Amino acid sequence: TCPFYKKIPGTGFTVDAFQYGVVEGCTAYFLTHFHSDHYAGLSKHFTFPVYCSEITGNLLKNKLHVQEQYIHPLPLDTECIVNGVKVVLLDANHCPGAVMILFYLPNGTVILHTGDFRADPSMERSLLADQKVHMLYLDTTYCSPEYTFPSQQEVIRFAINTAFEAVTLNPHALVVCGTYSIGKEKVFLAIADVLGSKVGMSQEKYKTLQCLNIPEINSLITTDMCSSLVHLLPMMQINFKGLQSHLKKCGGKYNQILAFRPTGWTHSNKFTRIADVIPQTKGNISIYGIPYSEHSSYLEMKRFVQWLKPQKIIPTVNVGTWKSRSTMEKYFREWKLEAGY
Ligand code: NI
């Protein structure tokens, strides 16, 4: 049944709750972003109001064929009324179209639902600075102190420098980048920009990217693989067998593959710096795992929460085991005693 951490008290609303059938008492279903564990259940047969960003609404119409009459896109950073309740959508710094949602309950309670997010100090100057938040529904994906990772900027500088050096040393090398969802577009777009190429990809992935309102996108991507020297493949294909196979397909145009797997966290992060990352190599194929995250590190999460000073935290991730729930509750209490709220 629908878990309590997907329901907004004092309203008829749910958040990211499309896989439970008709949730009794729900008058409006919000969707924070277009990732499959969150939209699971939606299709052209859905007949209740969906509230989302404009980009998420484009993906629902074009990829899932949800009918237009049930898609209710909202602008960001704008007070809107939904079924009698004031709401605001804020940029979550996750994937394209991802939002956090502020609910202003009739009784005076204010609720923030982060959806999935990567906390940032810029959020401390949004509409969140303007009133107190009582309850926080928090993306706790990486809520443990082992989870450190570099800035997105540091990771893209490493990728651009590695790719540019490899292709200038060997003009017959191909660059491949893995993907299985929206998000992390800066990785393949920044590498193609430094090389003077478009990114080549499948018709399905090209359609997805054309839903994202990314400026000048027609200048950056293509379905013509032959003209491109940065290719996107399914993340599953980013291994030695899948890559050797791909290289056969290119008909002797290339003699070397340099591949990137933008993972979340990997336990080389506890030891190794970004400067010190090395690939796995077999023959003329090399694979780099790069720690490009679209979720908060531990420290980023902690700063946001100590700034916000909520009265109550409701975790939305890692909630399925008693040891994970107890560990997170211990960190929340540490943060509150340290900061004095
Ligand atoms: Ni997500």
UniProtKB/Swiss-Prot annotation:
Localization terms from the record: Nucleus
Highest taxon above the source species: Eukaryota
Induction statement: During mitosis. The mRNA encoding this protein contains an internal ribosome entry site (IRES) in its 5'-UTR. This 5'-UTR generally suppresses translation while specifically promoting expression during mitosis, when cap-dependent translation may be impaired.
Transmembrane stretches, start-end: none
Tissue and organ distribution: Expressed in brain, heart, kidney, liver, pancreas, placenta and skeletal muscle.
Subunit structure: Binds constitutively to TP53BP1. Binds CDC27, which is itself a component of the anaphase promoting complex (APC). Binds PIAS1.
Function: May be required for DNA interstrand cross-link repair. Also required for checkpoint mediated cell cycle arrest in early prophase in response to mitotic spindle poisons. Possesses beta-lactamase activity, catalyzing the hydrolysis of penicillin G and nitrocefin. Exhibits no activity towards other beta-lactam antibiotic classes including cephalosporins (cefotaxime) and carbapenems (imipenem).
Family: Belongs to the DNA repair metallo-beta-lactamase (DRMBL) family.
This protein's name: DNA cross-link repair 1A protein
Annotated organism of origin: Homo sapiens (Human)
